[PDB]
Amino acid sequence: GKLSEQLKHCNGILKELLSKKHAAYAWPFYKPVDASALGLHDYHDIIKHPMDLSTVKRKMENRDYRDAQEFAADVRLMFSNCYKYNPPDHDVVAMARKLQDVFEFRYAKMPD
Numbered sequence: 001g002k003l004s005e006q007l008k009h010c011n012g013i014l015k016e017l018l019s020k021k022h023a024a025y026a027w028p029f030y031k032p033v034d035a036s037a038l039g040l041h042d043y044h045d046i047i048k049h050p051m052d053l054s055t056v057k058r059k060m061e062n063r064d065y066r067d068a069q070e071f072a073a074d075v076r077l078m079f080s081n082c083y084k085y086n087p088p089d090h091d092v093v094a095m096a097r098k099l100q101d102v103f104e105f106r107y108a109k110m111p112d
C-alpha cells in the first residue's frame, strides 16, 4: 500500500538522520533536550511540544505515524522548536539548518 511504502521512505530518512554521516550536526537532536541539565530553565515555557529523533524513532517503531505527513510534522516541529528557542546566530541553529536541508531534500524524493 501507498501509506506503508511512503512510511518505508520516512524510516529510511530517519535512519539517515541518525547515521554517522550526519553525526557532526545531528547529535543535538538525538535525545530530548534536558533543559535542567543545560541550564535552559525557560525551555518548557517557550517550547510547548518538545520533539527529538529518539521520540520520532519510538513513534515509528510503535506504528504511531499513520502517514508520511504525520512523520514530517514531528521532524519539522523538532527544527521549529530549535528556531523558536535559540537566537538565529547560535551554533545549534546552524546545525538544525544543515540537518533540515538533509531532511527536506530526501523527503522531496517521496514515492507517489
Ligand SMILES: CC(=O)Nc1ccc(C(=O)NCCc2c[nH]cn2)cc1OCc1ccccc1
Pocket: 028, 029, 033, 038, 040, 081, 082, 085, 086, 090, 091, 092, 095
Ligand atoms: C536542540 C537544542 O535546541 N539544543 C540546545 C539549545 C540550547 C543550548 C545552549 O546551551 N545554548 C547556550 C549556550 C551555547 C551556545 N552554543 C553552545 N552552547 C544547547 C543545546 O544543545 C546542546 C548543544 C551544545 C553545543 C552545540 C550545539 C548544541
